[PDB]
């Protein structure tokens, strides 16, 4: 499992042409903000490949 390379699986905003986003804010899947506890409808924005 290659841990150095990652990618963004899901995001709440559509990235415009030639626009990057290095922020790792926890995405909220339409619920109360979980303050980043990775529980109810809140997951990490990035995802590791292999």
């Amino acid at each position, epitope marked *: 499992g290659n841990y150095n390379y990652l990618y963004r699986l899901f995001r709440k905003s559509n990235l415009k042409p030639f626009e990057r986003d290095i922020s790792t804010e926890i995405y909220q899947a339409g619920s109360t903000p979980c303050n980043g506890v990775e*529980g109810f409808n809140c997951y990490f924005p990035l995802q590791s490949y292999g």
Partner: antibody
Amino acid sequence: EVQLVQSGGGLVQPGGSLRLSCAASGFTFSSYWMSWVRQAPGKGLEWVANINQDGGEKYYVDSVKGRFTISRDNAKNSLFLQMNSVRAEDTAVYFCARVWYYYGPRDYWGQGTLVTVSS
Amino acid sequence: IVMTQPHSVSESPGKTVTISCTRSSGSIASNYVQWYQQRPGSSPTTVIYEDNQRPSGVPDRFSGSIDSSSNSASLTISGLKTEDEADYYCQSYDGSNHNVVFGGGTELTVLS
């Protein structure tokens, strides 16, 4: 019908050890789980420990792991709880309640004993 | 894991007040969500169990339900009166380390 009473509280300085006792009368003391519940003055309920039927399997929460020793006795149908190395945050009202089944709620509670740690 | 619960909420006597016990990092369909009731200066007692069955000795007012759309529970208390002024709690076997987490504790008052 079931009667659950406890006594033996008080208050001492940190570093010592205390022990509570809860009897049982009105049900078979062989097929019912036991679990202690504490309630600090002004704070909500919490969980302390849970013992198996015979007394083999024991589980405690991380905050009270090690410093608490729960052990029941089916001979005289009694329950004991000796907690050494007490501290300030251990001040609460410890209840002894019988559990209907493991994956369920508690049926009958105790009466309450104010146990504070200050001398 | 923490059972989120409001500190205090009430309404005028005669309406229907509900209490939420939303969990933190546990599936709502894991185990049963129960509710308790503690009077000031006494020991708590069980008011509901299995989120759908009512113990013998409770009037036909407390009605529990389950809302899987937000992983939370509720309790429809119909006919709010003076005897409902108590402290309710919650319970659910939510954890892979054999630990029970209780609710926060709502201080239901009489807004008369």
